[PDB]
From a paper:
Crystals of P. aeruginosa LpoP143-259 displayed monoclinic P21 symmetry with unit cell dimensions of a = 48.8 Å, b = 154.6 Å, c = 54.1 Å, and β = 90.1°, and diffracted with a resolution of 2.2 Å. The resulting maps showed well-resolved electron density for most of the protein chain, allowing near complete tracing of the ordered part from residues 152 onward (see the STAR Methods). The structure indicated a monomeric form of the protein with no obvious crystallographic formation of larger oligomers. LpoP143-259 is made up of six α helices (H1–H6) of variable length that form helix-turn-helix motifs similar to those of TPRs and that are linked together through short loops (Cortajarena et al., 2004, Zeytuni and Zarivach, 2012). LpoP has a striking structural similarity to protein domains formed by repetition of TPR domains (prosite PS50293 family). LpoP's C-terminal globular domain exclusively consists of three repeated TPR motifs, giving it primarily alpha-helical character and a structure greatly similar to the N-terminal domain of CpoB.
In the major clinical pathogen Pseudomonas aeruginosa, PBP1B is anchored within the cytoplasmic membrane but regulated by a bespoke outer membrane-localized lipoprotein known as LpoP. Here, we report the structure of LpoP, showing an extended N-terminal, flexible tether followed by a well-ordered C-terminal tandem-tetratricopeptide repeat domain. We show that LpoP stimulates both PBP1B transpeptidase and glycosyltransferase activities in vitro and interacts directly via its C terminus globular domain with the central UB2H domain of PBP1B.
Residue numbers in the entry: 154 to 259
């Protein structure tokens, strides 16, 4: 396992788990300096932003992670569900259903 990326993920999850979504986001942006193309980093980053209520932001991060998630179906399913939840919180139930449709058949 790649230690540096995993260290930042681990640190991010400890911070999110503690209620410090700001630092978690900072830790995940530091993770990108090591792994700018890691969809799992983007997945967690989109989660933290979504948990902060920054839905439109989360959606674009998750949509970016998706472009790097090719041939990783469990992860693409996860990212689409995140995108659905981000559309929902933006008042968009059509784009949310269409996203959950892509999560179910990827």
């Amino acid at each position: 396992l790649d230690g540096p990326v995993l260290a930042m993920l681990t640190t991010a999850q400890q911070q999110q788990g503690s209620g410090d979504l700001n630092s978690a986001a900072a830790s995940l942006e530091r993770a990108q300096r090591i792994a700018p193309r890691e969809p799992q980093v983007l997945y967690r980053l989109a989660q933290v932003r979504l948990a902060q209520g920054d839905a439109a932001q989360a959606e674009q991060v998750a949509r970016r992670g998706l472009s790097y998630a090719n041939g990783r179906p469990a992860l693409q399913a996860g990212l689409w569900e995140l995108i659905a939840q981000a559309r929902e919180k933006q008042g968009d139930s059509a784009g949310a259903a269409l996203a959950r449709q892509k999560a179910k058949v990827s």
